[PDB]
Design a protein around this ligand. Structure first.
Ligand code: MG
Length: 245
């Protein structure tokens, strides 16, 4: 019931930030304390494991706008991130490989968190990794998407991470990702709250819903070392971020 709250970031370096996520996930052993990490990325596009940068984005556009390209460990589509997005990941012990159940539980936690702030949200309804919005992995505010998520599972553990639009440049978001703009929204379009307020609400929602007492802690030397190794050998390389490795 005791958990770890990691306010671990690497703003400026999205590839390293993603390395941290895989690091805490891979280093995790069944029975360890659950982990909830909050972080943010500066202007960048993150593509899913099974995607190739040149099919989903305009490398020319992003290069001209100084938008970092990064590829994550988890599957799913491409998303745009900026400092207006609040990202968070959860790592816990797992007894099965039920993907649908993991997303359903996390979304329940998210809905409860947003309810605290007076924002009524709900999970998307379709099982189609290819569509932009309304997926069961998305969180909607009416007909607008305000949060997306992805995950991975292995024997003994599971990773779930999301990116919620708090005050992100929705235009830029639509323009970098190859109507659409009319299908997404920021939490601040509904409630005037800061990133920390959203963070604290999520801490409460997850703690209450999962029944975990997430207490502020720090990354271990073991996890940090693994993250640096993953960055050095993979996340920092071009073959990886392009989808060739
Ligand atoms: Mg999603």
């Amino acid at each position: 019931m005791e958990g770890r709250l990691l306010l671990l970031e690497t703003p400026g370096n999205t590839r390293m930030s993603l390395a941290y996520d895989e690091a805490i996930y891979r280093s995790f052993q069944y029975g360890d304390k659950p982990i909830l990490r909050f972080y943010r990325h500066d202007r960048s596009v993150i593509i899913g494991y099974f995607q190739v940068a040149e099919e989903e984005v305009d490398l020319d556009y992003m290069k001209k706008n100084g938008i970092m390209l990064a590829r994550r460990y988890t599957g799913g589509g491409a998303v745009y991130h900026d400092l207006g997005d609040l990202n968070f990941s959860v790592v816990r012990s797992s007894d099965d490989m039920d993907i649908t159940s993991m997303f359903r539980t996390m979304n329940e936690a998210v809905v409860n968190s947003l309810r605290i702030l007076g924002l009524d949200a709900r999970p998307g309804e379709l099982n189609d990794v290819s569509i932009p919005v309304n997926k069961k992995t998305d969180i909607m505010a009416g007909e607008k998407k305000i949060m997306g998520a992805a995950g991975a599972m292995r024997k003994g553990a599971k990773l779930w991470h999301a990116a919620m639009l708090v005050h992100t440049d929705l235009d830029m978001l639509s323009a970098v990702l190859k109507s659409t703009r009319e299908r997404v929204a920021n939490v601040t379009d509904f409630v005037d709250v800061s990133i920390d307020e959203v963070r604290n609400a999520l801490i409460r929602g997850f703690s209450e819903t999962l029944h975990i007492d997430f207490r502020e802690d720090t990354i271990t030397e073991k996890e940090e070392s693994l993250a640096r190794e993953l960055f050095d050998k993979k996340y920092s390389t071009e073959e990886w971020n392009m989808g060739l490795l």
